[PDB]
Amino acid sequence: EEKEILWNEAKAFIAACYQELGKAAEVKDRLADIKSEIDLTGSYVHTKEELEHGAKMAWRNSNRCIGRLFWNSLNVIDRRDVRTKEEVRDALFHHIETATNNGKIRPTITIFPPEEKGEKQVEIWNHQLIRYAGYESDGERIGDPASCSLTAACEELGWRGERTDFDLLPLIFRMKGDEQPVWYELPRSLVIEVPITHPDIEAFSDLELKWYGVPIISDMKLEVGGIHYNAAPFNGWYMGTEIGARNLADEKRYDKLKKVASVIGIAADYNTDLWKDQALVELNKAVLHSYKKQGVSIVDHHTAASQFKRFEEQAEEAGRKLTGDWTWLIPPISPAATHIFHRSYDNSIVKPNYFYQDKPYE
Amino acid sequence: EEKEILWNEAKAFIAACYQELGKAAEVKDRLADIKSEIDLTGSYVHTKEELEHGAKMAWRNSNRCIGRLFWNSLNVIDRRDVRTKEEVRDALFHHIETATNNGKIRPTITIFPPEEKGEKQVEIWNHQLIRYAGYESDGERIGDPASCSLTAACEELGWRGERTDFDLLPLIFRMKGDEQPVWYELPRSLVIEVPITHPDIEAFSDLELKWYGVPIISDMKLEVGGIHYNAAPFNGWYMGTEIGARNLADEKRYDKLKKVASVIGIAADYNTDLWKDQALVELNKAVLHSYKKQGVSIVDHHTAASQFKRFEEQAEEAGRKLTGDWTWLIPPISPAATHIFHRSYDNSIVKPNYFYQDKPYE
Numbered sequence: 116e117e118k119e120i121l122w123n124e125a126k127a128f129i130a131a132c133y134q135e136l137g138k139a140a141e142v143k144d145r146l147a148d149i150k151s152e153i154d155l156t157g158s159y160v161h162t163k164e165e166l167e168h169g170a171k172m173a174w175r176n177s178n179r180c181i182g183r184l185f186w187n188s189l190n191v192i193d194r195r196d197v198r199t200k201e202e203v204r205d206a207l208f209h210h211i212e213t214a215t216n217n218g219k220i221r222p223t224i225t226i227f228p229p230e231e232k233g234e235k236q237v238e239i240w241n242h243q244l245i246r247y248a249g250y251e252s253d254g255e256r257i258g259d260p261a262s263c264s265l266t267a268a269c270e271e272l273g274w275r276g277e278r279t280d281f282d283l284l285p286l287i288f289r290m291k292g293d294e295q296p297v298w299y300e301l302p303r304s305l306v307i308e309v310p311i312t313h314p315d316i317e318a319f320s321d322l323e324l325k326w327y328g329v330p331i332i333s334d335m336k337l338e339v340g341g342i343h344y345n346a347a348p349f350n351g352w353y354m355g356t357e358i359g360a361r362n363l364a365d366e367k368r369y370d371k372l373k374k375v376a377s378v379i380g381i382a383a384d385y386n387t388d389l390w391k392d393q394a395l396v397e398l399n400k401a402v403l404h405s406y407k408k409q410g411v412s413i414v415d416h417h418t419a420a421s422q423f424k425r426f427e428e429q430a431e432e433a434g435r436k437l438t439g440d441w442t443w444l445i446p447p448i449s450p451a452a453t454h455i456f457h458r459s460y461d462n463s464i465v466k467p468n469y470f471y472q473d474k475p476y477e
Numbered sequence: 478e479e480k481e482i483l484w485n486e487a488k489a490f491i492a493a494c495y496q497e498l499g500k501a502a503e504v505k506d507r508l509a510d511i512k513s514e515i516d517l518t519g520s521y522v523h524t525k526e527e528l529e530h531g532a533k534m535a536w537r538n539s540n541r542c543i544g545r546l547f548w549n550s551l552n553v554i555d556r557r558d559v560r561t562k563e564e565v566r567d568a569l570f571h572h573i574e575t576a577t578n579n580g581k582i583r584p585t586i587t588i589f590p591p592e593e594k595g596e597k598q599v600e601i602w603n604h605q606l607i608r609y610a611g612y613e614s615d616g617e618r619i620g621d622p623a624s625c626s627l628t629a630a631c632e633e634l635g636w637r638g639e640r641t642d643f644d645l646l647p648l649i650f651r652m653k654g655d656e657q658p659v660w661y662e663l664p665r666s667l668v669i670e671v672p673i674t675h676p677d678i679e680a681f682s683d684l685e686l687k688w689y690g691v692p693i694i695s696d697m698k699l700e701v702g703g704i705h706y707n708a709a710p711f712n713g714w715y716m717g718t719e720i721g722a723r724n725l726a727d728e729k730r731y732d733k734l735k736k737v738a739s740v741i742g743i744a745a746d747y748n749t750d751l752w753k754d755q756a757l758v759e760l761n762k763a764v765l766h767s768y769k770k771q772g773v774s775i776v777d778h779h780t781a782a783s784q785f786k787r788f789e790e791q792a793e794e795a796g797r798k799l800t801g802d803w804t805w806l807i808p809p810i811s812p813a814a815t816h817i818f819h820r821s822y823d824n825s826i827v828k829p830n831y832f833y834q835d836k837p838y839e
């Protein structure tokens with residue numbers, strides 16, 4: 116019966132993929148080969164072309180992503196050959212280096228062996244490959260609160276953070292057959308970080324804020340034609356509001372707006388002064404400025420929405436249904452200044468796609 | 478069969494209303510009276526207490542409204558007695574005066590006779606009782622584009638606007654039995670307007686922006702216990718972003734952001750400068766300042782969201798289900814700085830409520 120589901124997903128994916136690739140005449144025999152492989156083995160193996168286009172389709176179908184215009188240029192690295200924890204570690208180090216690309220960020224996904232019978236071959240514990248630790252005890256909060264549970268799990272396993280506000284968490288993953296994950300410290304030479312300065316407020320550097328260059332989301336599952344790649348980290352470049360309006364601003368994250376207000380010289384006493392909004396704008400201007408000055412790729416939300424409008428236009432031209440989640444596509448700064456706010460989107464889920472999975476810690 | 482629907486809606490409303498009013502022991506006989514009235518006449522007439530609490534419940538159930546904390550203090554004016562166009566006009570003038578209250582705005586609804594057999598007794602054409610005209614011809618746009626279709630209908634009927642950017646539209650409504658609506662110019666003494674100035678940027682007044690004090694929405698239908706009050710204008714005070722982030726900012730409205738940027742002394746050339754966001758913040762600060770300086774009620778979005786959190790808390794305490802439309806409840810400026818952004822809401826429709834109806838023009 117799982118075989119049935121697999122076969123059905125296979126037919127739908129192969130037909131669609133090969134049609135997009137101009138390969139429709141090859142579908143019948145490919146499906147023939149797949150049906151026979153499923154019978155014999157219980158699964159099937161994607162060709163490199165299928166795997167690459169499948170990862171691209173999955174990005175294209177990511178309803179919550181404003182950056183999808185560039186779906187067809189995703190760099191897909193096939194690591195279905197890895198078998199040891201050293202190979203996984205080195206593949207993850209390599210992903211960081213090649214995605215970072217000296218600041219000219221390349222959207223990249225590295226795909227590890229898929230689940231066999233729901234059995235994971237490799238399980239990555241990190242939420243992103245580069246992320247800051249968080250701590251809380253005796254009233255004192257340090258670092259990124261969103262990382263508290265993973266930080267605690269790492270310290271259970273013998274890692275120890277320096278307890279700065281920006282400790283890099285180690286890579287942490289578990290191999291099939293092992294009871295516990297292993298962890299590895301990130302080599303600092305691989306990780307670009309950007310200090311946050313403001314284009315004309317010199318005191319802004321007094322906040323000593325920084326953020327890392329590349330968001331490499333490492334805990335979602337890529338599903339393609341019924342095959343479940345639970346370990347498949349992928350990255351883009353940031354949209355500036357992710358850092359300036361959320362990671363550094365949210366009260367349950369770094370909670371910096373009152374400090375921002377103070378350094379930009381405005382009172383934070385009266386809601387009617389809109390000091391939180393003003394602080395948000397200056398913090399978000401600083402974030403874009405800083406990434407730009409350092410030569411690290413980033414996009415602002417206006418430009419990102421303009422690209423997304425082109426994505427919508429391209430879908431229509433290609434004759435493809437567009438899907439989207441309006442509640443995630445609008446930016447958290449001036450959303451009504453974007454065309455996204457003023458239209459609606461069909462939030463239907465289409466596969467291939469990326470999916471949430473349960474955290475093995477917590 | 479319409480009688481059936483009416484009766485069913487009646488039972489549900491009367492039971493709920495009387496339970497909230499501590500009057501549960503009176504339901505059985507009231508329902509008895511109503512059932513007999515529906516049989517004889519095809520309809521039923523609300524008591525003044527039912528009508529008032531029904532209008533309040535309808536506000537309470539307005540999923541898209543952030544201002545609902547104050548639902549129970551709505552001022553309900555019962556004008557089911559009007560029969561002539563002069564009485565309607567004078568009732569609308571009176572609503573403006575009493576709602577405005579010299580700037581200390583009173584949330585008010587005036588309820589006119591309901592539809593009889595789907596037959597409207599009074600049909601108000603205005604979108605709001607106070608609203609600016611809009612014009613477009615030979616490439617030239619003047620006033621509020623959102624008012625273009627109603628403005629054209631009024632000028633078909635012999636009204637003529639001065640073609641400033643802020644012409645007040647006349648009241649315009651139609652009485653049962655008349656083929657055409659009538660219109661009446663608004664007495665300027667009844668209409669408070671606020672010039673927009675900025676707390677510390679003196680040049681802001683060069684934009685010569687203003688807005689009217691009181692939003693009095695006049696084209697929705699109030700439904701209570703199966704009775705359809707299609708003519709029932711109601712108002713609150715503004716949340717500042719309605720004016721500063723939408724009415725004065727949207728490209729399809731007054732489209733003022735480039736002008737705002739220029740007067741606040743920033744370039745409007747590069748998306749990465751976030752000049753639209755900065756302009757939005759300063760325009761929204763100016764709007765709040767100006768209403769406050771003039772003694773006209775207004776609320777900022779942070780304070781409004783804080784009140785709405787209390788509304789949520791009160792619903793839970795009362796044991797009432799909360800409903801909401803997240804896509805309208807978030808403010809269009811810094812939405813993630815409000816608790817609304819970080820939770821979800823059940824968008825179910827509960828009656829009594831306010832509903833859209835077709836425009837008799839266009």
Ligand code: HEM
Pocket residue numbers: 170173174177179180181182183185189222223224349350351352353354357414419443469
């Ligand atoms: C190239 C630059 C990229 C930009 C600027 C971008 C931008 C974003 C933004 C702003 C979000 C919303 C996150 C939030 O508001 O919390 C998001 C979500 C997402 N993006 Fe993209 N993205 C890019 C590339 C990618 C790539 C390469 C993939 C996959 C191959 C991807 C898959 C997704 C997914 C799956 C989500 C939703 C995550 C969730 O549900 O939690 N994105 N993106």
Ligand code: HEM
Pocket residue numbers: 532535536539541542543544545547551584585586711712713714715716719776781805831
């Ligand atoms: C007392 C101050 C009030 C404030 C500050 C307030 C605030 C707002 C805001 C900001 C919206 C969203 C409009 C938009 O984003 O386009 C709204 C929608 C709404 N409000 Fe309120 N409101 C108030 C009073 C009232 C009253 C007294 C009623 C009815 C008795 C009411 C019924 C509604 C309805 C029905 C909507 C949705 C309109 C639609 O679907 O187009 N509000 N309110």
Ligand SMILES: Cc1cc(N)nc2ccccc12
Pocket residue numbers: 330332349350351352353354357
């Ligand atoms: C791949 C990616 C890029 C980005 N700028 N933001 C993301 C947020 C969530 C998941 C993936 C994301």
Ligand SMILES: Cc1cc(N)nc2ccccc12
Pocket residue numbers: 692694711712713714715716719
């Ligand atoms: C009654 C009311 C008040 C307000 N500030 N805004 C509204 C927007 C739409 C409908 C009614 C509204």
Ligand SMILES: [Cl-]
Pocket residue numbers: 330357362
């Ligand atoms: Cl992030």
Ligand SMILES: [Cl-]
Pocket residue numbers: 692719724
């Ligand atoms: Cl309005």
